[PDB]
mmCIF file of C-alpha atoms in Angstrom:
data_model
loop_
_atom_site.group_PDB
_atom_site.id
_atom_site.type_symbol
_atom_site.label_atom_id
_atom_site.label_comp_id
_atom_site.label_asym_id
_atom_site.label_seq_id
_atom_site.Cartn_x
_atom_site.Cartn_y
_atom_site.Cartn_z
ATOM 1 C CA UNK A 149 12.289 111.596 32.167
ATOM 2 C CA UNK A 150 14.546 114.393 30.783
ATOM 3 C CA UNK A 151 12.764 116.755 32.695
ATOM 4 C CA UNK A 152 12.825 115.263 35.818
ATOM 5 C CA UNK A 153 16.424 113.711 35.648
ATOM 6 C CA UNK A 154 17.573 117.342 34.481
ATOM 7 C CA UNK A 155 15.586 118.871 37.669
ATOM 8 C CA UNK A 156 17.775 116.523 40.272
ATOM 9 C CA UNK A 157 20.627 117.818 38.694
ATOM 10 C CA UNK A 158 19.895 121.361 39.224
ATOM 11 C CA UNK A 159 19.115 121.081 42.765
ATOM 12 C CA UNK A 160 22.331 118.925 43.587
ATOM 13 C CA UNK A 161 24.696 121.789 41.841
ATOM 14 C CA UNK A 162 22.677 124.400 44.143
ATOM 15 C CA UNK A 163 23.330 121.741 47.430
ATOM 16 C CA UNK A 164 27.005 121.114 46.144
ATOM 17 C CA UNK A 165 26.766 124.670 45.860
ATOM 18 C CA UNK A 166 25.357 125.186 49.803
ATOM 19 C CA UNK A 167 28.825 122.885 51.155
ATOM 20 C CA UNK A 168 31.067 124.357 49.379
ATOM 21 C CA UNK A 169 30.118 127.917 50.255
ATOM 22 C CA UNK A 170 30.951 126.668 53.562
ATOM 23 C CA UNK A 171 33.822 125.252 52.911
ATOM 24 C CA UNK A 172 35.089 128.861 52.325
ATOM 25 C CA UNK A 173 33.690 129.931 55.550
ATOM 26 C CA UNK A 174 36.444 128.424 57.044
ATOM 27 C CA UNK A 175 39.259 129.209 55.464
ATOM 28 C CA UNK A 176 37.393 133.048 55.962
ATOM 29 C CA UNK A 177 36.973 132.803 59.261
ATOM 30 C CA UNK A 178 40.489 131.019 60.246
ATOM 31 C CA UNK A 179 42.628 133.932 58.289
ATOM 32 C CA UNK A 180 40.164 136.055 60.078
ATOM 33 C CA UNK A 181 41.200 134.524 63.306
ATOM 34 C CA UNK A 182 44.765 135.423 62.748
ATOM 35 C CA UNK A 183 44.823 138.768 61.494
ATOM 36 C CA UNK A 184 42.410 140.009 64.731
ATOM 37 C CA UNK A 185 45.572 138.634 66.182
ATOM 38 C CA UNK A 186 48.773 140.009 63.981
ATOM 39 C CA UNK A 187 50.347 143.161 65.327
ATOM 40 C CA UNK A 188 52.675 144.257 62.672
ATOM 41 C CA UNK A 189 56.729 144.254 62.628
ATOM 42 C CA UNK A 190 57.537 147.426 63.974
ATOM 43 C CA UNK A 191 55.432 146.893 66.637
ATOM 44 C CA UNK A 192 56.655 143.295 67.583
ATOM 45 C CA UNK A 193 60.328 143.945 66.724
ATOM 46 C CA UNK A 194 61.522 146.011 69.198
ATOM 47 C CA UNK A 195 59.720 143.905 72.080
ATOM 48 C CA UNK A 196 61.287 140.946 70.353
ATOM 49 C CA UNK A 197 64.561 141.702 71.212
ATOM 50 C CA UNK B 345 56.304 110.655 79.069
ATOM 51 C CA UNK B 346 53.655 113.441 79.377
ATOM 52 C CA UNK B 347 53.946 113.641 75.550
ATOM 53 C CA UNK B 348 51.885 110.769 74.947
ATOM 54 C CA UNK B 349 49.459 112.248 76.915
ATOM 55 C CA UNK B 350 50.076 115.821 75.526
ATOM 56 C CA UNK B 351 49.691 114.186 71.245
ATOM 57 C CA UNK B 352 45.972 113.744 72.269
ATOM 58 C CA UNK B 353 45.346 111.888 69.402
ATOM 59 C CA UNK B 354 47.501 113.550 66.873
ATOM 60 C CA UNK B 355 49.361 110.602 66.841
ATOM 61 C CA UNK B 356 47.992 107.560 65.229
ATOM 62 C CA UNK B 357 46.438 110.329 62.227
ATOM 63 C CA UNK B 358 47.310 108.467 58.950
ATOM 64 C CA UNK B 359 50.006 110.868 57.231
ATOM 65 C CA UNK B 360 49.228 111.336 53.572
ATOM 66 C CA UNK B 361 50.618 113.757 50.919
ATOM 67 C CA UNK B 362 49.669 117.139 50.161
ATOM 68 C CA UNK B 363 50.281 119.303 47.406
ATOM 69 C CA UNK B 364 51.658 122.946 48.363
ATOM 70 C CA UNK B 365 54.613 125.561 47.871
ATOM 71 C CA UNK B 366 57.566 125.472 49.930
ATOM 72 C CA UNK B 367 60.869 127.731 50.708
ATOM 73 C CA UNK B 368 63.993 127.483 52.634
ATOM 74 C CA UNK B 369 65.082 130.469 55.223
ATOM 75 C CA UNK B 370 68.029 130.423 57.571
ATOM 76 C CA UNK B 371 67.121 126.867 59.467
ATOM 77 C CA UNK B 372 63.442 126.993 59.027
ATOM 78 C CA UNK B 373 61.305 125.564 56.212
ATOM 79 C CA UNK B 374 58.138 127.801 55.123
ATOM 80 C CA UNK B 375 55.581 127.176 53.148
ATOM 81 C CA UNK B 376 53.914 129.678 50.869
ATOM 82 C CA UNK B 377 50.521 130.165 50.076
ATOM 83 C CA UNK B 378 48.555 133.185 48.713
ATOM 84 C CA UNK B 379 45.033 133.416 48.335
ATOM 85 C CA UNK B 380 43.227 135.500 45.907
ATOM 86 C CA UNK B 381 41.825 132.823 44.145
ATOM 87 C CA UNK B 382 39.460 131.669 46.690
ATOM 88 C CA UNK B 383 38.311 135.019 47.448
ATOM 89 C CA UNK B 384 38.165 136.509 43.321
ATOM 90 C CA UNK B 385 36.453 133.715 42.369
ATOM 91 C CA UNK B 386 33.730 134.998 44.622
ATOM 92 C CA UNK B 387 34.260 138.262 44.005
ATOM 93 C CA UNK B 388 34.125 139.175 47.717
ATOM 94 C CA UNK B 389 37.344 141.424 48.666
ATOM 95 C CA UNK B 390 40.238 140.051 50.140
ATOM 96 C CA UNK B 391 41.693 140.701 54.061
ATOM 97 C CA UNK B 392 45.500 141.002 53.113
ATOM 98 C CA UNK B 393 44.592 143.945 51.025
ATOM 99 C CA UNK B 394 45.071 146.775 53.444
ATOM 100 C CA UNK C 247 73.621 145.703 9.816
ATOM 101 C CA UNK C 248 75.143 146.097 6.310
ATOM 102 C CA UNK C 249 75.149 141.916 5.892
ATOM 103 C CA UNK C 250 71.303 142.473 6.008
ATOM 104 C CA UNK C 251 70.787 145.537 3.449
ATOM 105 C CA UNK C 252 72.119 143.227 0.990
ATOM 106 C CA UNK C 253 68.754 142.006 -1.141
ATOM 107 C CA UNK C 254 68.183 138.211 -1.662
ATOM 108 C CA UNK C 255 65.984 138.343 -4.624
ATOM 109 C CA UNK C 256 68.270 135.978 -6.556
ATOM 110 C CA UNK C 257 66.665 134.798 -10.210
ATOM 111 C CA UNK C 258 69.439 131.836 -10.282
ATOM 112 C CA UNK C 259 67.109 129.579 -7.570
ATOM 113 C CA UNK C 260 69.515 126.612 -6.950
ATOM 114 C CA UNK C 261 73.027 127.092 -8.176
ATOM 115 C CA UNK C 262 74.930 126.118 -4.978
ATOM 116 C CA UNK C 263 78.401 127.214 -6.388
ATOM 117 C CA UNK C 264 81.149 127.202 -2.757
ATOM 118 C CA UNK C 265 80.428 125.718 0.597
ATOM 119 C CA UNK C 266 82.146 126.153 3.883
ATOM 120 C CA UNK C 267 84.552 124.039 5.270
ATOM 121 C CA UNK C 268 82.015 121.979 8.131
ATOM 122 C CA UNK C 269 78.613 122.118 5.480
ATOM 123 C CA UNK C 270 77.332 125.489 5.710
ATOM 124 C CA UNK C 271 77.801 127.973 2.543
ATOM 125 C CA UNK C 272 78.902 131.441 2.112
ATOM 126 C CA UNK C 273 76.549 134.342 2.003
ATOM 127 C CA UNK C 274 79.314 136.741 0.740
ATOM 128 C CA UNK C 275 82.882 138.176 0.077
ATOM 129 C CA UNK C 276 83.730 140.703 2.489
ATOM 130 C CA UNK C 277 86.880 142.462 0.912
ATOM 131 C CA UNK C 278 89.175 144.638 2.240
ATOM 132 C CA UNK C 279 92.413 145.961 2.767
ATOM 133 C CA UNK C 280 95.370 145.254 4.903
ATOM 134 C CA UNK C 281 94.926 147.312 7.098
ATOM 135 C CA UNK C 282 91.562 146.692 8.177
ATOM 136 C CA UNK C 283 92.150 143.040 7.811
ATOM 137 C CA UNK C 284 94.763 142.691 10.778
ATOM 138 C CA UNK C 285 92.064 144.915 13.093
ATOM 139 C CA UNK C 286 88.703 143.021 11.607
ATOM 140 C CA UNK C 287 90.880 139.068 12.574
ATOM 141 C CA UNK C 288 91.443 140.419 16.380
ATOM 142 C CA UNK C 289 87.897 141.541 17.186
ATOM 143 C CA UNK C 290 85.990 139.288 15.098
ATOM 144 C CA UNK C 291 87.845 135.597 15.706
ATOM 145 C CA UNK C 292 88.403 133.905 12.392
ATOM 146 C CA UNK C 293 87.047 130.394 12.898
ATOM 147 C CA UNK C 294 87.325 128.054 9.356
ATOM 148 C CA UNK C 295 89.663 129.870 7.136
ATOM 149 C CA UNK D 56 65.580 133.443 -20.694
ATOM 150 C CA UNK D 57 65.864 134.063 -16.814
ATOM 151 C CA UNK D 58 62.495 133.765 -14.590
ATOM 152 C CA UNK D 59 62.205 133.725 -10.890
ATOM 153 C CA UNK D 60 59.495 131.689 -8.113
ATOM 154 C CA UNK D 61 58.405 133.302 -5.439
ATOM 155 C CA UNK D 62 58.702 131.135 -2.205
ATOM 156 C CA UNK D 63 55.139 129.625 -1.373
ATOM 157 C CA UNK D 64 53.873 129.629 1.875
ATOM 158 C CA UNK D 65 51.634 127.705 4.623
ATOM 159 C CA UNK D 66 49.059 128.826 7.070
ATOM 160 C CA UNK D 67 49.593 125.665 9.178
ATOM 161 C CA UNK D 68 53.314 125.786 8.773
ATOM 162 C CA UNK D 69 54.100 128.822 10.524
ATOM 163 C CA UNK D 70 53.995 129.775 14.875
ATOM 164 C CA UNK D 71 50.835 131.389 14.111
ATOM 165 C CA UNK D 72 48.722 128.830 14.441
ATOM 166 C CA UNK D 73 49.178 128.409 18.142
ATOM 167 C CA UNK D 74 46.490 131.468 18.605
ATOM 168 C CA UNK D 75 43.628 129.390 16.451
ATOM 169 C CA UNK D 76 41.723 126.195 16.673
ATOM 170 C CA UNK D 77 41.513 125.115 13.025
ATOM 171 C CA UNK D 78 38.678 122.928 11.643
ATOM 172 C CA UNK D 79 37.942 123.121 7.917
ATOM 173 C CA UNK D 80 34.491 123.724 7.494
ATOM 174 C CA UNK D 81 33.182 122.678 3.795
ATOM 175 C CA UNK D 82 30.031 124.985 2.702
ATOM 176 C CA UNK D 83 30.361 128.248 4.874
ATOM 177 C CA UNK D 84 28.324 129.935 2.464
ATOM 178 C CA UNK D 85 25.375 128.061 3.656
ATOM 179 C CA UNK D 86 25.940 129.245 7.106
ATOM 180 C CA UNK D 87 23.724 132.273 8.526
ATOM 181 C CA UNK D 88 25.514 132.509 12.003
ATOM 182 C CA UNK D 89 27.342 130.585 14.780
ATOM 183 C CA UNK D 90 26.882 130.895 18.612
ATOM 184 C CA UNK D 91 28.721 129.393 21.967
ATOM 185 C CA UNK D 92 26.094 129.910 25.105
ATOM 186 C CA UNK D 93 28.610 129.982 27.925
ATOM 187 C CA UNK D 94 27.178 129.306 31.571
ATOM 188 C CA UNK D 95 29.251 130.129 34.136
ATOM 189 C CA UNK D 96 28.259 128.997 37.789
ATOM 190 C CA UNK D 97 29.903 131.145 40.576
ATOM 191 C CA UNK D 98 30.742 130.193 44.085
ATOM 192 C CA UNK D 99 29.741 132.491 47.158
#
């Protein structure tokens, strides 16, 4: 029982594991997002004005 | 009147509250956030580092 | 810086002789002459006396 | 005759003790040797 209650823990913590290495694709993939478009200040200032 | 039509749905979104930094410029509010923890945790480098 | 080259190695170990005027007691007897007295009462403020 | 007492002192009585987790351990004599297995799971 021990060894089959302590296998469906292991493959839960690698499956919690396969979400929530996901979960950090987006917040990757957003601030990648962003910086393709970011020029930098002394590009933008000038034009800002 | 277009507005209604322009929330799409962002309206009616129950409002809850969220935990973060905040900071106070000129008129404008910003919030603050810096990540390094969810990128050296993983040990992957980080974008802001240029 | 001389109030702490003083030792306090004391063999007495409980005779309590003067005490201030608000509870505290005196650690020493700084003597000196006139002279030095009317500069040492500007600078340092005399607070008890 | 004049003697003096040197002042006594406490482990647990000074800021010290805020770098140590303290548990009295009675026969340390019988011990060979200690171990903490850490197991640290790591995000990707």
């Amino acid at each position: 029982f021990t060894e089959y209650a302590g296998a469906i823990k292991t493959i839960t913590s690698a499956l919690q594991f396969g979400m929530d290495a996901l979960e950090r694709g987006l917040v990757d993939t957003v601030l990648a997002v962003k910086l393709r478009h970011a020029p930098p200040v002394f590009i933008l200032k000038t034009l800002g004005d | 009147g277009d507005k209604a039509a322009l929330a799409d749905g962002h309206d009616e979104i129950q409002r809850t509250r969220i935990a973060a930094s905040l900071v106070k410029i000129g008129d404008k509010f910003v919030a603050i956030e810096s990540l390094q923890r969810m990128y050296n945790e993983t040990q992957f480098p980080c974008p802001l580092n240029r | 810086d001389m109030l702490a080259a003083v030792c306090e190695d004391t063999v007495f170990k409980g005779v309590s002789t003067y005490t201030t005027a608000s509870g505290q007691q005196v650690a020493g007897v700084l003597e000196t002459t006139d002279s030095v007295m009317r500069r040492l009462m500007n600078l340092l403020g005399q607070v008890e006396s | 005759v004049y003697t003096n007492v040197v002042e006594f002192v406490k482990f647990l009585e000074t800021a010290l003790a805020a770098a140590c987790v303290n548990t009295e351990f009675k026969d340390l004599r019988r011990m060979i040797d200690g171990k903490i297995q850490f197991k640290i799971s790591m995000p990707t």
